[PDB]
Design a protein around this motif. Structure first.
Motif, short mmCIF file in Angstrom:
data_model
loop_
_atom_site.label_atom_id
_atom_site.label_comp_id
_atom_site.label_asym_id
_atom_site.label_seq_id
_atom_site.Cartn_x
_atom_site.Cartn_y
_atom_site.Cartn_z
N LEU A 1 0.60 -1.24 -0.29
CA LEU A 1 0.04 -0.01 0.06
C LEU A 1 0.81 1.24 0.03
O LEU A 1 0.70 2.23 -0.80
CB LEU A 1 -0.93 -0.04 1.22
N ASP A 2 1.90 1.39 0.70
CA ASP A 2 2.89 2.48 0.94
C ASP A 2 4.24 2.20 1.60
O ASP A 2 3.98 1.18 2.04
CB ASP A 2 1.91 3.63 1.66
N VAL A 3 4.83 3.16 1.43
CA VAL A 3 6.25 3.10 2.19
C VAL A 3 6.40 4.42 2.95
O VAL A 3 5.98 5.61 2.66
CB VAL A 3 7.43 2.97 0.91
N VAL A 4 6.54 3.99 4.37
CA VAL A 4 6.45 5.10 5.38
C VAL A 4 7.55 5.43 5.96
O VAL A 4 7.58 6.67 6.50
CB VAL A 4 5.36 4.70 6.44
N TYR A 5 8.64 4.84 6.21
CA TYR A 5 10.00 5.20 6.65
C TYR A 5 11.07 4.46 5.95
O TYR A 5 11.12 3.45 5.54
CB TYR A 5 9.95 4.49 8.20
N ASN A 6 12.34 5.29 5.74
CA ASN A 6 13.43 4.85 5.25
C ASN A 6 14.57 5.47 6.01
O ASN A 6 14.59 6.76 6.38
CB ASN A 6 13.56 5.15 3.85
N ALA A 7 15.68 4.57 6.50
CA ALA A 7 16.79 5.13 7.28
C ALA A 7 17.70 5.85 6.56
O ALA A 7 18.52 6.83 7.06
CB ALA A 7 17.51 4.15 8.00
N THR A 8 17.81 5.58 5.26
CA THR A 8 18.89 6.31 4.35
C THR A 8 18.59 7.89 4.28
O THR A 8 19.37 8.84 4.66
CB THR A 8 19.04 5.88 2.94
N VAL B 1 1.39 -2.91 4.36
CA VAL B 1 0.86 -3.76 3.33
C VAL B 1 -0.70 -4.11 3.84
O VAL B 1 -1.28 -3.56 4.87
CB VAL B 1 1.47 -5.17 3.63
N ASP B 2 -1.44 -4.86 2.82
CA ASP B 2 -2.86 -5.12 3.04
C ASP B 2 -2.83 -6.31 4.06
O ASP B 2 -2.13 -7.04 4.38
CB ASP B 2 -3.42 -5.61 1.66
N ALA B 3 -3.78 -6.02 5.25
CA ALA B 3 -4.13 -6.70 6.26
C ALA B 3 -5.12 -7.81 6.41
O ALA B 3 -5.18 -8.70 7.03
CB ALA B 3 -4.16 -5.95 7.61
N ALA B 4 -5.63 -7.88 5.23
CA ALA B 4 -6.65 -8.95 4.96
C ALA B 4 -6.45 -10.08 4.88
O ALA B 4 -7.13 -11.09 5.82
CB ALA B 4 -7.69 -8.48 3.65
#
Ligand SMILES: [Mg+2]
Ligand SMILES: [Mg+2]
Ligand SMILES: [Mg+2]
Ligand SMILES: [Mg+2]
Ligand SMILES: [Mg+2]
Lengths: 79, 260, 192, 144, 96
Positions: C78-85, C103-106
């Motif tokens: 669904l999305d990307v929310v955090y990146n350490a770089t 990610v989808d939880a279904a």
RNA sequence: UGCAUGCCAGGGGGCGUCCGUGAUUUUUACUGUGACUAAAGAAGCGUGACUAAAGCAGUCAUUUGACUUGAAUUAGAAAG
RNA sequence: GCCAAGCUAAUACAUGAACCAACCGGGUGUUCUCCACGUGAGACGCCCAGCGAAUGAAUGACAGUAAAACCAAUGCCUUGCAGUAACACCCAGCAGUGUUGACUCAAUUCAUUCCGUGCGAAAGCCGGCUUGUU
């Protein structure tokens, strides 16, 4: 039609005398049929031979462990 | 990769003259290492003299007349290394490649029921797919179900005709060994102790029949029997006994004069 | 082209290395994939030895694992929310190893009902339709394990945070693992 | 299962080992899951590696770094890098013509796991490993 | 030869002790033992009774399963002989 | 394929192998041995290619072949 | 250095082989047959279970102390624990034991995945005789 010889209908060209006829490819004869069927029989025989070889090895491993189990049990019984 | 082998770069055991030619037969990859092998062309031409040149050697070899480990070899660059059984049915020779006390390759003549037996040193043990134990030998053989007591360093006596293992000789002190590398190559002795150095090379201390003590790395020893009096294989004439240089020289002078 | 050799680097003394050989194919590098979120799009790369790497350019589905349950499921990204770089990789929706994605939880919710007979949201698995051999199996599984509170709140909302474990630019896949324990709490703070 | 350790997690990415699942064979004395292996060559694993909180992906005892090759001894020279130290190997080199020696030294960059805390002047045992940086080829195995 | 008989499959969790005696109707069975391995050991009265019991039961269907029967080499008197030896040390164990 | 297992009894010490815990823990140089380390070249054993520089050959019977022919040994810094 | 149109091959390229044909495991059915009034047992049905690759979970050992009770379940003994590899039949020993100096390695089990960027018995060739749908 099927089950009909194709060598008789092959186109032959004559030169001036030689009658030039192409060699028929993919003509599966009884000789070729036996050769193909032998490959499948050999393949199934090989895997069965290895399965029998695995069984004998597993029997040796199990029997050795059983003998040690029987040795100390007799020693404990004679104790 | 390299396809050629200069004659000066060839191993000295091949006994190829430096003035005869520029090149030597480059051993193909196979059962034995390039540095520790004797090519079939060298054997059929320089050792047995059945072929006067390489052209006749190829004529003999490409016909399949020479068998190594009960299988014809048509390639003159076949490695054909230590403890290999070479037999020529058309003439009935049946020798085995071994090391003499000098370290040179020796063709020890074999008899029937002895050409069927080959000794293999276990160099690695691993588990194949399906939980199948496999032992890798010094000549590149992979044994699909070795003896459960097999360990790295032990030797398996193998039936080449039947393609099966007949017995196992463990690498322990008191056993007869033959050195296959280093300055002591070709000497036969008995294991006294093994100096185990983790990470480094293990050192084996041996004593021969006379009583002389000599050492080598543990990777250079090859168990050949339970003790010096009981060897599972026939060794060359010298019996792996290194002789004093001064003593050897005098004997040769005495024998030469005695002949004349 | 791109090289991975040390010839261009300075010595520890700061001196310049005088290069006396041309660049070798055995030391090459290649341009990065920069895999982004989107419908699947990959390009094979012939590597040394004749083997093929899969340079993924766009991915939006992956095989994500629930480590505590010891299972995995194919879910859509669904999305990307955090990146350490850098947060720039979050802004562009770049998929790299160890990046935090939603990610989808279904599918995980569906498997929870099938395994434990618990409906988290209370297609829709009917727990009452299970055989009595299955409801008895639910009791054994339920007593040993209790679901983590932080995981359950995500599953109700429909998206659960996860960490990417595969390398999309090397294997062409976007596999991952659901965040649990102190790792989940660590990233929850970073995402406000 | 566990709360966030603030003293260990200050790296903008979560610090963890890769051989075990920490939020679940390898259980330390403090009842935590912590991977730790036994390196060969008769070297004892320090108690800090067995029972510790630090995360080091280059530590020879708690990571995938393996020790093989040369084992050397030296004296700590500088301790200003983070998790890296410089050691000195002082030796006498023989000049054949003059039949005399001269003093020589070499400097090596060595990775130091957070289980040793060496000081300048201490003497260490180092073991060869895979390249860990531009100049690091050795790992600290013991401090004397 | 022997009075004991091996009987399998006898599923203990799905049958009672009296349920398996129905197949032994018409025979005078002294001792009957049921095991976890889905088999039963039964000691009969005479060798002829046991022998005549295995020429008509091998292959028969009992409780939804084909029965496999064979004469067993176990002897009844050895069990009683060993039991007292086991029984005395049970009471001897209390004495320590 | 239980076609297996045991048949002096004992205690007491002597060892091999692997692991754990303990010495208010001892190295380096030097030196003696040993291991490892391509040839060509150098040193050198043997050998009347007519001698020699060479070469690794050849020799002896007179044979449908012997010598189970020979091609020995060394040195080769430093570091490891 | 070159087009365009006509032919025709394969060990080029593509496609593709059920039965014969095993062992072993996991998930399930409002399926039935029995036992007990559910750590029940057994059949049958269905979904999957090859090599290699990917992520995740678990194995890849042990080796720092000597005896008693109680509850529950289950093994045996008989109608209370002696003693005994383990396993609820069809296999009563068909791995309780990979390797290294050291491994996140070898290999095995479970869940999910592979979509072109893998996996024919080349749907191949030639010989002998005895001349052979083994
Ligand atoms: Mg054809
Ligand atoms: Mg090594
Ligand atoms: Mg092809
Ligand atoms: Mg192991
Ligand atoms: Mg291990």
């Amino acid at each position: 039609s099927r089950t009909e010889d194709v060598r008789k209908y092959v186109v032959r060209r004559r030169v001036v005398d030689r009658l030039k006829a192409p060699k028929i490819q993919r003509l599966i004869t009884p000789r070729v049929k036996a050769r193909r069927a032998k490959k499948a029989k050999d393949a199934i025989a090989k895997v069965r031979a290895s399965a029998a070889e695995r069984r004998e090895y597993l029997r040796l491993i199990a029997s050795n462990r059983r003998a040690l189990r029987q040795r100390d049990h007799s020693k404990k019984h004679t104790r | 990769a390299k396809k050629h082998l200069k004659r000066l770069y060839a191993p000295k055991d091949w006994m190829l003259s430096k003035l005869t030619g520029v090149f030597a037969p480059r051993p193909r990859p196979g059962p034995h290492k390039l540095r520790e092998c004797l090519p079939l062309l060298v054997i059929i031409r320089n050792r047995l003299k059945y072929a006067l040149n390489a052209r006749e050697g190829e004529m003999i070899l490409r016909q399949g007349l020479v068998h190594v480990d009960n299988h014809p070899r048509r390639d003159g660059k076949y490695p054909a290394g230590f403890m290999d059984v070479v037999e020529i049915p058309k003439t009935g020779d049946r020798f085995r490649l071994m090391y003499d006390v000098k370290g040179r390759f020796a063709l020890v003549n074999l008899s029937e029921a002895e050409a069927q037996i080959k000794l293999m040193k276990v160099v690695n043990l691993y588990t194949a797919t399906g939980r199948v134990p496999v032992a890798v030998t010094h000549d590149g053989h992979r044994i699909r179900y070795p003896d459960p007591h097999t360990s790295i360093g032990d030797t398996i006596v193998y039936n080449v005709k039947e393609k099966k293992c007949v017995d196992l000789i463990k690498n322990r002190q008191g056993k007869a060994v033959i050195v296959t590398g280093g300055a002591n190559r070709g000497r036969i002795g008995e294991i006294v102790k093994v100096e185990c150095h983790p990470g480094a090379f293990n050192i084996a201390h041996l004593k021969d029949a006379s009583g002389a003590e000599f050492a080598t790395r543990a990777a250079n020893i090859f168990v050949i029997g339970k003790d010096l009096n009981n060897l599972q294989v026939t060794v060359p004439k010298q019996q792996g006994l290194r002789m004093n240089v001064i003593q050897e020289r005098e004997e040769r002078l005495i024998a030469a004069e005695a002949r004349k | 082209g791109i090289v991975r050799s040390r010839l261009h680097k300075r010595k520890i003394t700061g001196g310049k290395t005088k290069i006396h050989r041309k660049r070798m194919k055995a030391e090459l590098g290649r341009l990065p994939a920069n895999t982004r979120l989107g419908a699947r799009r990959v390009s094979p790369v012939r590597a040394r030895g004749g083997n093929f790497k899969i340079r993924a350019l766009r991915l939006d589905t992956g095989n994500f694992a629930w480590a505590s349950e010891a299972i995995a499921h194919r879910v859509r990204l669904l999305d990307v929310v955090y990146n350490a770089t850098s947060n720039e990789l979050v802004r562009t929706k770049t998929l790299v190893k160890n990046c935090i994605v939603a990610v989808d939880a279904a599918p995980f919710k569906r498997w929870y009902a099938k395994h434990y007979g618990i409906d988290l949201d209370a297609d829709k698995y009917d727990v009452n339709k299970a055989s009595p051999k299955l409801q008895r199996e639910w009791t054994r599984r339920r007593r040993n394990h209790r679901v983590e509170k932080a995981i359950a709140d995500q599953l109700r909302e429909g998206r659960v945070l996860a960490r990417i474990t595969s390398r999309p630019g090397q294997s062409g896949r976007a596999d991952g693992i659901l965040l649990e324990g102190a790792e989940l709490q660590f990233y929850l703070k970073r995402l406000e | 299962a566990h709360a966030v350790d603030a003293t260990i997690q200050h790296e903008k990415a979560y610090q963890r080992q890769t051989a075990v699942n920490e939020n679940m064979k390898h259980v330390n004395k403090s009842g935590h899951i912590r991977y730790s292996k036994k390196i060969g060559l008769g070297f004892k694993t320090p108690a800090k590696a067995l029972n510790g909180k630090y995360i080091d992906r280059k530590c020879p005892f708690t990571s995938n770094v393996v020790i093989r090759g040369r084992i050397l001894r030296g004296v700590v020279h500088s301790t200003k890098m983070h998790r890296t130290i410089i050691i000195r190997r002082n030796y006498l080199h023989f000049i054949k013509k003059y039949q005399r020696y001269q003093k020589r030294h070499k400097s090596l960059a060595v990775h130091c796991s957070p289980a040793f805390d060496p000081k300048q002047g201490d003497e260490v045992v180092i073991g060869q490993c895979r390249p860990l940086s531009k100049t690091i080829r050795y790992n600290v195995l013991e401090v004397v | 030869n022997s009075s004991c008989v091996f009987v399998s499959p006898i599923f203990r969790p799905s049958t009672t002790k009296a349920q398996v005696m129905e197949l032994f109707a018409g025979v005078k069975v002294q001792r009957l033992r049921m095991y976890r391995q889905n088999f039963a050991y039964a000691y009969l009265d005479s060798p002829a009774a046991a022998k005549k019991f295995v020429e008509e039961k091998n292959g028969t269907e009992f409780r939804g399963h084909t029965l496999r029967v064979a004469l067993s080499a176990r002897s009844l008197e050895k069990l009683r002989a060993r039991q007292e030896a086991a029984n005395v040390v049970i009471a001897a164990h209390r004495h320590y």
